[PDB]
Structure formats: C-alpha cells, structure tokens
Amino acid sequence: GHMQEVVDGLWVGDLVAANDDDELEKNGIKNILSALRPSLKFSDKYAVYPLEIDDSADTDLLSHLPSCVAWIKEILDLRQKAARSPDIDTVAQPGKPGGVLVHCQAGMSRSASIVAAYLMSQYDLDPMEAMTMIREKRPVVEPSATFWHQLGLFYTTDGKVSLKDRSTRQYYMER
Ligand code: VO4
Q1: If residue 82 lies in a helix (H) or strand (E), which one and from where to where?
Q2: Which protein residues touch ligand 1 with a CB less than 6 Å away?
Q3: What residue stretches are annotated with the Tyrosine specific protein phosphatases domain (predicted)?
Q4: Quick one: fold of 3-174?
Q5: How far apart are alpha carbons 133 and 151 in whole angstroms?
Q6: Which of 17, 69, 115, 144 has the highest CB neighbour number within 10 Å of its CB?
Q7: How many angstroms separate the CA atoms of 152 and 43, rounded?
Q8: Residue 141: which of 7, 44, 14, 10 has the closest Cα?
Q9: Burial class of residue 133, CB neighbours in 10 A (0-12, 13-18, 19+)
Q10: 6 alpha carbon – ligand 1 mean position (Å)
C-alpha cells in the first residue's frame, strides 16, 4: 500500500495515499498532516495541517515537531472519546473524530520523521526504536541525515525544543 497503519488510527504514507479518497474513507481517516510544498487543496471533508516544508538538507523540521505531536494527540484523543494545546500551530485545522494520515511525497522522510517524533513522545522511545516500529509496517522509511539529527535533538530535550541544550542551540545557530 501507499499508506500503512503504525498504531491504531495513525497512518504514514505518500502523495498517492493523500489523494485516494476511497482508501481514506474505507479506513475512517478524517485528518491529514500534509508535509509538502506547495500545499495541496483538500476537500473540507478533512481537517488538514499543512506543513509547508521541503525534504532538504537545510530543512528545519525540529521547530514544528511539538506542534505536530500535539495535533496527532488531539486527533487520537478525540477519536477515542467518539468511540486547544498551546503547542499547536494555528494553521492546523481543528481535529475531526477519525484517523490521521501523515504524508509527504514519498512517505519516507518528512512523514516518517513526524510519526517517529509522536511515537518517541507517546511510548518513551529513542529515534531508532521509533523508526524501527514504523519500518516494521512501512519498510522503505528512511529519514534524511538532518532529520535523524533533529530527532536526536527532540529526544534530548524531552519534546520541548529548548536551547538550554547546547546541541539544539548549535543547530539553530548554524542555520
Ligand atoms: O516526500 V518525503 O521525501 O520527505 O519521503
């Protein structure tokens, strides 16, 4: 498939998956975390978090990870009750009661890194443990080198991006 379910209600996938409304409906997905530039035009059937970032060696994903993690938590909590967090960027639409697909163009780097950050925060995993958990469902995932580094910074600071950490401050200084 073009998307795979990592844990209950949380999917990672590619550009094909984001456009396949049949598969999204069949799996009860009503939220899309869309990590792509330019942003796509989605139907209002979905709540969408447009993350306008590239998959480049100088892309800053770290600054957005607390917002991404909090948005996924907002959705999955709401989905369970059906059966705002100050961390969430205001461009993220209010979560709807259903699953969430996190996607980029290929479903390997931006999207897998965002899902890994969520798994690190939710299950107290380190980046490798998180990424292995995803890879066992979607074997092609492979963060870029800079995303692996940024996941390490996110791990160190317990998911609050703090520049009291030397390495995090250094990352932002070099940018
Ligand atoms: O389109 V993604 O390259 O960040 O797998």
Answers
A1: helix 65-82
A2: 55, 104-110
A3: 84-139
A4: Protein-Tyrosine Phosphatase; Chain A (3.90.190)
A5: 15
A6: 115
A7: 35
A8: 14
A9: middle
A10: 17
